[PDB]
TrEMBL record, chains A, D, E:
Name of the protein in its database record: Type I-MYXAN CRISPR-associated Cas8a1/Cmx1
Region of the whole protein represented: 391 to 499 of 525
Domain of life: Bacteria
TrEMBL record, chains B, C:
Annotated organism of origin: Nostoc sp. 'Peltigera membranacea cyanobiont' 210A
Superkingdom of this protein's organism: Bacteria
Protein name listed in UniProt: CRISPR-associated protein
Length: 109, 285, 285, 109, 109
DNA sequence: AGATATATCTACGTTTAACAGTGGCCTTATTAAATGACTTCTCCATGATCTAC
């Protein structure tokens, strides 16, 4: 695979780890009740991502989600590559990549 | 002698949600596509302006075959046998059965947004409590001026006097199909570039171009003027009117430029009256 | 001698849907194919421009064997026997009824789109709540400058004076077959590259290239300028006019390049007048 | 390649080193067996970064945070480039870069 | 290029040289093996910069800081430009530039 | 006049804490083409027979 495909794969894994962190925070914060909302959280995440209309707002939401996730091993191993990929590539393609990562989220067994 | 009327008029500044494309999700996608400089520009369908002119003709006498109900939201045909000799609608816009099929006297181009469209989205909710799938929705708008190009073959009209009502309607265009309830956008024009010549050669395409990202200055162009300076598009055949006149009169060396000796009227009504007089004199009406 | 006229013409910028191919489902696909760099471009067929030239010759008052009844939308033959001596269209465009056939002086190629086709589409729908199978539809459109190549043989014309009306028609081309109701695209030239030589070899075919993949820039191709530099394609036999003249004059070292000593005119009418004078002098007209 | 991207990457590194300095400061401040607040500090930093109302706001905060970081070598190497980048550029893009840096400091530790 | 950014950079250099002079002064003040207070001095400088209430406040402060810095060669060659830049421009912008200079002096030594 | 050691006062403390949205919805209808055309000519192979040398 070419370099761009590797960068895209690391971005997918980075987003998945960020969602791992956010879902862990949701589980910890709302342990009360029968079950915390995750399916509703996933639907809200999709709605927020589709809400973004230009590069500025979408990049703001993406960065905010990334920081909210926590430590990001995939984003640890690759700083400059993923940072340049985020800054350079058009925000729409980033939206496709984020949605694909959302749909590809492997639950922790 | 053959005669044609080519023109490109510019709308006023305001919000626009006139031509929703597909409504992908909750977002009623305001239809858009690439334009000058590779920036995404929102579009207003030319069929929308044709429908607006049809409605204008129907509203004020002017027998038309297709009557818009305004109550049942349906179109009624007075006579299925289209007769361009009598109806204004058939004579002007043409028809197709699938007979004569006409050709249409009026040729329209899709209206383009003079400014690129970034995201311009808007929320929508339905009161409070008891919320269903229809409660939350989005609508795209656009705060620009729209520009479109049109052309009529004068000779091709069955009744030569029918050119006057279309000019009156373009000057007084009714609501163009769109979200008038939420985004009431008047499509009346504020700057006109009309040419009335006897050969098909039709410059003055979408000349109005200002870019200047998010603004409302609406400068005329550099290429159109270039053309005017070079020698073609003779000023005697050009008609410019509207707010663009104010910008034009402030250009340096305007007194010596060939653009000066063109028909320039700051008021739109005066220029339209003069053009109507010229057309009536030329066509023998 | 054996004089020929070759030219590559570029059109203005606008929305065009002139060459719908066989439609699929609900969408009316406009014909497209591959071109430079492997990107899909939209094509307007040469038969359309030949029909436009025929219509121009009919309208200007020349004989024209094939009469096109606009109201009937039908084509009629003035005489069943083709007479290239008397009829301009039979002289120029040729015929084959199946003498019997003529080679035809005018040889024209397809009209390619200078900018690659992204895939922009437009939705159209019949108004009113009463909706049927023919309610909504999609029409494909393209915002591009179109470029086509043509070549004529002056000697092959039965009457040599017939070259003048064809040039006038090219510079004043009537509507090219398309959808003028919703995409009225003027095909009038705005930049020419004409060659009038006694040798046949032609190096001006599709000499136009885009600066950016989505833009209305229309700069001259590097190959054409380089070939003029190298020594062939004599500048004395070159004729360039239109909007590209400005870009050529803004080039560096232009006063030293061989492009300087070639016939270049900002106004297209002046260049056409000069070329017509040269042709009339060369062919004894 | 594309020296603007180089400046953006070195700014990311500068912000990371400044946050490293502030982490060292808070680790020095804490005493006894109390858990040094790092997750709390990171969340506080993110919340204050999101809170901003143009130009003076969040630019004063950026400068103050960089000063709090202390000695930072990446900013030492390149003075004029980073100074012009901070003075110029819309503040929202600087916020995007800083947030990224929040998510991309964690590679260091 | 962009002469106002030239003034901004020479202001950065002037501030750095003035704080170099102040650091030399305080190094001269201390004696014997006690660690000269410099990180504490940097913190004090930042805190005093942050404390201000527009116009006269922080302008008397910047003038006094430049005076206590000593002789500034860059200020000597650029008297008029520096003075005009200081007199004009919002004082918050000058404080931001000064904080950037606070973080910009380390490559000097 | 050249070479050399010395002297220059503040300063410090520069926020400690707790939170970084709690809810509900994430389009409801309808239409998913309507027509007609789907090459146009010629260029045949072979043997019997006529006819000129």
């Amino acid at each position: 695979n070419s370099e761009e495909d590797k960068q895209y794969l690391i971005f997918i894994k980075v987003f998945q780890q960020a969602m791992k962190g956010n879902f862990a925070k949701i589980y910890a914060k709302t342990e009360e009740g029968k079950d915390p909302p995750i399916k509703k959280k996933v639907e809200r995440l999709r709605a927020e991502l589709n809400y973004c209309y230009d590069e500025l707002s979408f990049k703001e939401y993406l960065s905010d989600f990334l920081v909210r996730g926590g430590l990001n091993k995939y984003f640890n191993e690759h700083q400059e590559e993923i940072a340049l990929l985020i800054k350079k590539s058009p925000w729409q393609e980033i939206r496709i990549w984020s949605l694909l990562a959302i749909a590809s989220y492997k639950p922790k067994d | 002698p053959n005669y044609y009327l080519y023109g490109t008029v510019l709308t006023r500044y305001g919000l626009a949600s006139l031509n929703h494309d597909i409504r992908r999700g909750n977002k009623t996608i305001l239809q858009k596509g690439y334009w000058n400089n590779g920036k995404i520009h929102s579009f207003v369908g030319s069929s929308a302006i044709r429908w607006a002119l049809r409605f204008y003709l129907q509203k004020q006498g002017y027998l038309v075959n297709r009557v818009w109900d305004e109550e049942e939201h349906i179109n009624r045909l007075t006579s299925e046998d289209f007769d361009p000799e009598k109806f204004y609608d058939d004579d002007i816009f043409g028809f197709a059965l699938l007979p004569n099929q006409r050709m249409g006297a009026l040729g329209m181009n899709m209206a383009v947004s003079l400014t690129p469209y970034d995201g311009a989205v808007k929320l929508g909710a339905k009161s409070g409590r008891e919320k269903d799938s229809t409660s939350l929705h989005f609508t795209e708008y656009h705060a620009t001026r729209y520009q479109y190009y049109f052309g009529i073959d004068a000779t091709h009209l069955k009744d030569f006097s029918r050119i006057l009502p279309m000019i009156d309607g373009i000057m007084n265009l009714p609501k163009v199909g769109g979200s008038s309830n939420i985004f009431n956008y008047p499509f009346c024009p504020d700057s006109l570039v009309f040419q009335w010549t006897n050969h098909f050669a039709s410059y003055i395409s979408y000349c109005f171009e200002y870019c200047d990202p998010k603004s409302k200055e609406a400068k005329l162009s550099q290429e159109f003027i270039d053309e005017v300076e070079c020698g073609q598009i003779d000023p005697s055949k050009l008609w410019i009117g509207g707010t663009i006149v104010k910008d034009l009169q402030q250009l340096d060396n305007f007194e010596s430029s060939p653009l000066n000796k063109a028909h320039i009227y700051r008021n739109r009504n005066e220029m339209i009256e003069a053009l109507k007089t010229v057309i009536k004199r030329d066509l023998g009406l």
